[PDB]
């Protein structure tokens, strides 16, 4: 008989199975559509989630109740040192889909990216790409032939880049290597751009800019084995119910004589790949700016780094991206920032952000001071200072 009271199901069936992701770096499943008239550009970038802080925004939004008013909003900081271009991959179209035709690498690869190819770097002889580097000798035959093959046959061009993780405060020395699609001119122009940019760095402000909506692709924070109540949001059973109350009381009461795939079951929570969209860049901060944490309204000379550093991450000494809201993943996880797949038609994409103040108080407690100088000036002279 019919259920007496209607209610929506618990959870989303399109995010199944709730298994652990195959990698700590989430895959980009779709790149923005290529317009052959535009100049050559990267479709994405790689960074490390450092933490979150608070800003005050002077909002200009016509028609809104908070027009010409100040709003306090949460932001996320991603440390983004420049990436290093080290390779190019060509893709051809087949009746079975896209197929990688060829890959061409640069002459010199740093140890930071060489470590990605090793499980035991300290015992290895570090022989990676040693014979490959010899193919650049005597006019680069072979390398030129494969580049010509990519020019002649490939319909999609991607560039292999890696992060400079040695510039981050991370204890990991092994860099992350990824493919980024080149959207721009012709295939030959993409190949020429990649060849000219071999062993060269690309900064984050040559890929993105302020007031732009981007997408964050990352693996969420893991939580291990979890019950149905917190895995799916099901209602708890009454107190002292036999055989537990953090369960679904009846997993089946009808003919099929099986447990349906759409019934909530206990299992892994978190560590899933997620692609969240439409996060607005509030600031593209440069690493060489002594006051990248200051605004035109707040004249205090300070950086983006909070007092005591970001908790569990450290200081920010490179270029960074400040986007509003939150993104999937925890601190110090590698994240991919992707260009929007469509031209956004909301006015928020056309809004221009003007920050009035950026919070730099300590996140290791109830921080009340923005700078150590402010803390010293408020407290006064201590016993050890005299």
């Amino acid at each position: 008989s019919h259920r007496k009271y209607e209610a929506p199901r618990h959870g989303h069936l399109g995010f199944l199975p709730r298994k652990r992701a195959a990698s700590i770096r989430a895959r980009v499943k779709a790149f923005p559509k290529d317009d052959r008239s535009k100049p050559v550009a990267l479709t994405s970038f790689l960074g490390y989630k450092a933490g979150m802080t608070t800003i005050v925004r002077d909002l200009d939004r016509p028609g809104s109740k908070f027009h010409k008013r100040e709003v306090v909003e949460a932001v996320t900081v991603v440390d983004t040192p420049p990436v290093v271009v080290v390779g190019v991959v060509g893709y051809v179209e087949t009746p079975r889909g896209l197929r990688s035709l060829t890959t061409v690498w640069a002459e010199h690869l740093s140890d930071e990216v060489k470590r990605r190819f090793y499980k035991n770097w300290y015992k290895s002889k570090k022989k990676a790409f040693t014979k490959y580097s010899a193919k650049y000798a005597q006019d680069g035959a072979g390398i030129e032939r494969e580049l010509a093959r990519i020019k002649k046959y490939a319909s999609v061009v991607r560039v292999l880049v890696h992060t400079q993780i040695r510039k981050t405060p991370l204890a990991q020395k092994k860099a992350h290597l990824a493919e980024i699609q080149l959207n721009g001119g012709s295939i030959s122009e993409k190949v020429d751009w990649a060849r000219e940019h071999f062993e060269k760095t690309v900064a984050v402000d040559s890929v993105f800019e302020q007031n732009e909506m981007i997408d964050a692709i990352a693996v969420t924070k893991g939580h291990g084995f979890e019950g149905v109540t917190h895995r799916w949001g099901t209602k708890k059973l009454p107190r002292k119910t036999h055989r537990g109350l953090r369960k679904v009381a009846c997993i089946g009461a009808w003919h099929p004589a099986h447990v349906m795939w759409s019934v909530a079951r206990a299992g892994q929570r978190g560590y899933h790949s997620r692609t969240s969209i439409n996060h607005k860049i509030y600031r593209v901060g440069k690493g060489d700016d002594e006051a990248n944490g200051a605004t035109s309204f707040d004249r205090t000379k300070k950086t983006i780094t909070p007092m005591g550093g970001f908790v569990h991450y450290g200081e920010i000494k490179n270029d960074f991206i400040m986007v509003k809201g939150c993104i999937p993943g925890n601190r110090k996880r590698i994240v991919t920032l992707r260009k929007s797949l469509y031209t956004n038609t909301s006015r928020k994409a056309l809004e221009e952000v003007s920050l009035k103040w950026i919070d730099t108080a300590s996140k290791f407690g109830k921080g009340r001071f923005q700078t150590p100088a402010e803390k010293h000036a408020f407290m006064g002279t201590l016993k050890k200072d005299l």
């Binding site: 000219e196 760095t201 690309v202 890929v207 800019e209 038609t345």
Partner: protein, 87 residues
Amino acid sequence: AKSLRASSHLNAKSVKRRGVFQKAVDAREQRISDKLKEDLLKQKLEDLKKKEEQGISTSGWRDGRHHTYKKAKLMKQSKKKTSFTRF
């Protein structure tokens, strides 16, 4: 309420999208391309300054290793009868 897949709303969105939003996107793309070219030029200048102190047919096989491996693989598939396209 009209759904996200409503035809009239999507048509109005496309009419809006062909204008000011696309103009802003194109301007941002031009500025980003200019900054990318400047970044490359600055890297070239720094590399030149650093070095100042210090101072096609695609036919056939890719290489001999590729030829040997592909011939061995095709012979193995012919021997084991595990080929997708050839009997």
